[PDB]
């Protein structure tokens, strides 16, 4: 029930083989898997908690220029030399100046000049890698127990953490079984290509090559005192005014510019425990060992009373809060979904098995009624409470929503999205392979282009495809244009 009302929940219903079903646990989303006779339970990825980060580069933003010194020489007497050049902290640039007899030099012409200034760095930026022997994903598993305090609770679940070295685990659900995890944590995100920079109590998951490309003075990052910065010329700016003299500036703090230059990065919570809260993970669920816990119970023989008025979730299912009244025992909850006057059983139970545990706590039965006018009966007797609820929408709307959700998933996961809720089908492997090849070509072609650039190129390709008289060219260009438009529309986030 932890995944009720989230708004990003996606159902998984099919099972195959040994009841193993794979699911891709996107961090924001939460998967609510269900089966024919297994306890329906919802899953989400809590945190991935990178730990023991090792730094490798400090790059500066705020410098400070001290001890500006200059030397000058007559024309045709060589470059100006200054003893401070052979020091790491000194940044020194040559230039040319003009001088005649007014400057004490007999020869008329252009003279050399140097200006060395010691550059000190204040408030550097650390960039830290993460090694895979110290990364701890965390998966929380919650069963649809029907508990009183479970409807939207964010703290009721069974934690089952996984590390890349210890891939598989077994989370023992209390009095339900053992949800075997054959998860694959290595393919989720490639932290080898991503290094984690932290500046001024903030963090971002930037690409490694992009970090290595940006123009700021870096250093070894060995945590020693007086580090020597490479490429100091990116902060100091020498300004020869009228070929008379030279001046030095420090150019100020690059913090705001750096914040702008992180426009596509994803922020994480380095503060406290370096807890990364962005990413995704794929796993498969071995439901062979689970048990229903409710098969041996008897039918509840007395009337119910609902506490909270029936409220409908964002995904079209119905959530009910009933409380047992008459009989004193833990019993199975009768349930049926008849129509207005036709007795057609069409409503499914999202909860695997509703059971009153104590009779003093209400139950949290959730159901998915068919769209239209359908009655709900939750009692064995004639005095059973009757709930009539009119659902909106049609199967066309559900199909459109499913198609949009699948397209948006494939626009993010990409290759991995083809085996989101896969049951191991032979055709699904073929589809995943084809999508993998095509996406590997597509991202190679389109890597590093803006969202607006993608839209422009896509509309241009669509125009080319429409105009061209070649069938192959027309079809390929139209397809690529449509794909590029739909991708560029949703790329930014």
């Amino acid at each position, epitope marked *: 029930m932890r995944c009720v009302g989230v708004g990003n929940r996606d159902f998984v219903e099919g099972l195959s083989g040994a009841t193993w079903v794979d699911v891709v646990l996107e961090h924001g989303g939460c998967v609510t898997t269900m089966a024919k006779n297994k306890p329906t339970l919802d899953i989400e990825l809590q945190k991935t908690e990178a730990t023991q980060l090792a730094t490798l580069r400090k790059l500066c933003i*705020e410098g*400070k*220029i*001290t*001890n*500006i*010194t*200059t030397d000058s020489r007559c024309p045709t007497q060589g470059e100006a030399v200054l003893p401070e050049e052979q020091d790491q902290n000194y940044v020194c640039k040559h230039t040319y100046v003009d001088r005649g007899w007014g400057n004490g030099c007999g020869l008329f012409g252009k003279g050399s000049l140097v200006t060395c200034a010691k550059f*000190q*760095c*204040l*408030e*550097p930026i650390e960039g830290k890698v993460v090694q895979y022997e110290n990364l701890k994903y965390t998966v929380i598993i919650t069963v649809h127990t029907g508990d009183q305090h479970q409807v939207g609770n964010e703290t009721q679940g069974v934690t089952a953490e996984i590390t890349p070295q210890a891939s598989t685990t077994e989370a023992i659900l209390p009095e339900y079984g053992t949800l075997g995890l054959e998860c694959s944590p290595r393919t989720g995100l490639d932290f080898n290509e991503m290094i984690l920079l932290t500046m001024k109590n903030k963090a971002w998951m930037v690409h490694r090559q992009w970090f290595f490309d940006l123009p700021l003075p870096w250093a070894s990052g060995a945590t020693t*005192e*007086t580090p020597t910065w490479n490429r100091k010329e990116l902060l100091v700016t020498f300004k020869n005014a009228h070929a008379k003299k030279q001046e030095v500036v*420090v150019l*100020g703090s690059q913090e705001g510019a750096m914040h702008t230059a992180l426009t596509g990065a994803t922020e994480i919570q380095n503060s406290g425990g370096t807890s990364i809260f962005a990413g995704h993970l794929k796993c498969r669920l071995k439901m062979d060992k689970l048990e229903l816990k409710g098969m041996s119970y008897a039918m509840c023989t007395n009337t119910f009373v609902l506490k909270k008025e029936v409220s409908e979730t964002q995904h079209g299912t119905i959530l009910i809060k009933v409380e047992y009244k008459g009989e004193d025992a833990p019993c199975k909850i009768p349930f049926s979904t008849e129509d207005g006057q036709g007795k057609a059983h069409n409503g499914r139970l999202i909860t695997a098995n509703p059971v009153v545990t104590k009779k003093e706590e209400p139950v949290n039965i959730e159901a998915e009624p068919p769209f239209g006018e359908s009655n709900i009966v939750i009692g064995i007797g004639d005095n059973a409470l009757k709930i009539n609820w009119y659902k909106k929408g049609s199967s066309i709307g559900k199909m459109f929503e499913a198609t949009a959700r699948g397209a948006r998933r494939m626009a993010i996961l990409g290759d991995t999205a083809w085996d989101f809720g896969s049951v191991g089908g032979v055709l699904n492997s073929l589809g995943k392979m084809v999508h993998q090849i095509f996406g590997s070509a597509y991202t190679a072609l389109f890597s590093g282009v803006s969202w607006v650039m993608k839209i422009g190129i896509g509309v241009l390709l669509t125009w080319i495809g429409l105009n061209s008289k070649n069938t192959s060219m027309s079809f390929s260009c139209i397809a690529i244009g449509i794909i590029t438009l739909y991708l560029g529309a949703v790329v930014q986030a």
Partner: antibody, heavy 122, light 113 residues
Framework: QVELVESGGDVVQPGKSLRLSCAASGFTFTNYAMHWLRQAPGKGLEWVAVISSDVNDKYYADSVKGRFTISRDNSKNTLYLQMNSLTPEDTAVYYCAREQAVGTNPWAFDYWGQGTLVTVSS | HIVMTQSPLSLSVTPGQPASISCKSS????????????LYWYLQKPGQSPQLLIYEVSSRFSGVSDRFSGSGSGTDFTLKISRVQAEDVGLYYCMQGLHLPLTFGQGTRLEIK
């Protein structure tokens, strides 16, 4: 946004040594030269000692030279001042001044600590 | 050991009026290599900690009101306030940063007349 808070100030009899501590926050400490300054009551501001960015280099005011010791615990982000052979004259409100954020001088003051009071009397 | 002598020792001025403080050095505080002049002006407000108003002879520090401006070239420097408000009570300690044993001035006092 930077915060420099004093610590260690208390009463002390003449001749008894005292160790002052300047806790720092709001900036990277290891890159900043730090200073100690004092203001005797009703007297002009008088700079005491300076420690530069490198820990080894230190300097002291001649009026207090040879009586004090200045140390930097940059791992804990705090500054240490060791006062030895205190004199009843050496009673004042003591400050902790950061290096200048922008400028040319290797040593300057831009942000002053809240201030601590040390009293040397019998 | 450059000693800083300030011309005014007490400046009682009415609000909305100018004010001129002088801090005269015993030696030119003009560093030869860069040509800058390292003279600083602090203000310790009563019951407060000193601030930094002009971190050079005439380049004012950040967060300082619009009216505080300095001058002076070799030894005769000034601190000009355009319009005095009621918050200007304090002690305008000047300072020289040219030499390592830097010494403050005695510091003038400003009050509302």
């Amino acid at each position: 946004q930077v915060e420099l808070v004093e610590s260690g100030g208390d009463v002390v009899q003449p001749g008894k040594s005292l160790r002052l501590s300047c806790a720092a926050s709001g900036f990277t400490f290891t890159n900043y030269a730090m200073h100690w300054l004092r203001q005797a009551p009703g007297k002009g501001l008088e700079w005491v000692a300076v420690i530069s960015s490198d820990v080894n280099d230190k300097y002291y005011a001649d009026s207090v030279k040879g009586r004090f010791t200045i140390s930097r615990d940059n791992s804990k982000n705090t500054l240490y001042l060791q006062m030895n052979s205190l004199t009843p004259e050496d009673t004042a409100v003591y400050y902790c001044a950061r290096e200048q954020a922008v400028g040319t001088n290797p040593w300057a003051f831009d942000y002053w600590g809240q201030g601590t009071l040390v009293t040397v009397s019998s | 050991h450059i000693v800083m002598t300030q011309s005014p020792l007490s400046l009682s001025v009415t609000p909305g009026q100018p004010a001129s403080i002088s801090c005269k050095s015993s030696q030119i505080s003009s560093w030869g290599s860069d040509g800058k002049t390292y003279l600083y002006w602090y203000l310790q407000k009563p019951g407060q900690s000193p601030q930094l108003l002009i971190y050079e002879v005439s380049s004012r520090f950040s967060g300082v009101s619009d009216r505080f401006s300095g001058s002076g070239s070799g030894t005769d420097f000034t601190l000009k306030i355009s319009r005095v408000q009621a918050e200007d009570v304090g002690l305008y300690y000047c300072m020289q940063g040219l030499h390592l044993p830097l010494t403050f001035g005695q510091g003038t006092r400003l009050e509302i007349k």
